[PDB]
Amino acid sequence: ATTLKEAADGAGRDFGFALDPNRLSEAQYKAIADSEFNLVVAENAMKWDATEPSQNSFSFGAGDRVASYAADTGKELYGHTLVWHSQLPDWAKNLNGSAFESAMVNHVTKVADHFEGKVASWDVVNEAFADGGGRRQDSAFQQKLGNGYIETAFRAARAADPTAKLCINDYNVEGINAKSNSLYDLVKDFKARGVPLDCVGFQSHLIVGQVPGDFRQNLQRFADLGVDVRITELDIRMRTPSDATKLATQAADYKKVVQACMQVTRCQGVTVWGITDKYSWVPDVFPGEGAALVWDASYAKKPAYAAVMEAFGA
């Protein structure tokens, strides 16, 4: 293999990236997107703010651009995300009770219907749980609808799209801890009761030198509930600027994550949360952190690149 795409293809797995469709007009970004990945997810274009800016008025141009990119380049398309507490438009936050429930249901229905037969899998619900266990505490969905909203969302998604793989996605659930235990309980419950649910996403926004040693064990116990698993938003951030030591540790870390996936038969693959450090979300959220991706800000391959290739068995 001479590309990460070839390595993943050869392994029978997915290697994806988070796309900003506006960056496709930057030819270097498009060249790498085209050649190095066999799956794409919209970094932002399919979120609620991006798709339903006012009640029952939809703006699918950006999401369609991502879908068309996937179809044109023959990549799997992964859908992110139907229900998420973050970036929720004010019009939705202003609704309550049944009016809010109906807005959620309408959103799930219209977005899943719009992309039906193009999007292969959806993050139906994103970030429902709390670090330390139990439900997230700053969510409009949890606060207005309570525990049942997750099941409502999954059933609505299946009603709209009978075949798409329906996933729940979260972060800080890579190791076995109170948060991933809560997520595990729900997955087991849903499968026991026949609630539509096909997959679990592990975001894997990790810090350099801190990959959970129990990641494989955790992925495996989820797979054993009878669902697929996926590493959905991998990046491994360090204190900037990078140096040789940090880049080597980061490379080792990428290898650890991709190997954990390789070691679990139902792990569909790994998606990294962007292409280049140039555009990574990390520096804006974490002051003085960054350099989290496989390409640097000048689109040079970092040591992480060879580590990913090696881990896919290339």
Ligand X SMILES: OC[C@H]1CNC[C@@H](O)[C@@H]1O[C@@H]1O[C@H](CO)[C@@H](O[C@@H]2O[C@H](CO)[C@@H](O[C@@H]3O[C@H](CO)[C@@H](O)[C@H](O)[C@H]3O)[C@H](O)[C@H]2O)[C@H](O)[C@H]1O
Minimum separation from the CB atom of position 123 to ligand X (A)? 8
Between residues 84 and 215, which has the closer beta carbon with respect to ligand X?
84
**Residues 191-250 within binding reach of ligand X (CB under 6 A):** 203, 233
The answer to whether the beta carbons of residues 42 and 16 sit under 8 Å apart is no
**Residues 133-172 within binding reach of ligand X (CB under 6 A):** none
- Map residue 42 onto helix, strand or coil: strand
Can residue 44 be called a binding residue for ligand X (CB under 6 A)? yes
How big, in percent rounded to 5, are the helix, strand and coil portions of the chain? 45, 20, 35
Minimum separation from the CB atom of position 248 to ligand X (A)? 25
Query: How many residues of this chain bind ligand X (CB under 6 A)?
Result: 9
Minimum separation from the CB atom of position 107 to ligand X (A)? 15
- Diameter of the chain measured on Cα atoms: 55
The answer to whether the beta carbons of residues 257 and 211 sit under 8 Å apart is yes
Minimum separation from the CB atom of position 125 to ligand X (A)? 12
- Give counts: helices (H), strands (E), the chain: 13, 10
Can residue 56 be called a binding residue for ligand X (CB under 6 A)? no
Left, alpha or beta for 262 (phi > 0: left; psi -120 to 50: alpha)?
Answer: alpha
Minimum separation from the CB atom of position 304 to ligand X (A)? 18
Chain Cα centroid distance, residue 241? 26
* β-pairing verdict for 228-239 and 289-290: antiparallel
Residues 6+ apart with CB under 8 A from 271: 14, 15, 16, 17, 18, 39, 41, 78, 230, 231, 232, 233, 234
Between residues 203 and 268, which has the closer beta carbon with respect to ligand X?
203
**Residues 102-131 within binding reach of ligand X (CB under 6 A):** 126
Can residue 277 be called a binding residue for ligand X (CB under 6 A)? no
Q: Select from 42-50, 135-143, 176-184, 288-296 the region that touches ligand X (CB under 6 A).
A: 42-50
Q: Which of 29, 48, 100, 281 binds ligand X (CB under 6 A)?
A: 281
Between residues 99 and 285, which has the closer beta carbon with respect to ligand X?
285
Q: Which of 54, 56, 68, 86 binds ligand X (CB under 6 A)?
A: 86
- Catalytically active residues are 233
- Map residue 306 onto helix, strand or coil: helix
Name the residue number minimizing CB distance to ligand X: 281
* Chain positions contacting ligand X, by CB under 6 A: 43-44, 47, 86-87, 126, 203, 233, 281
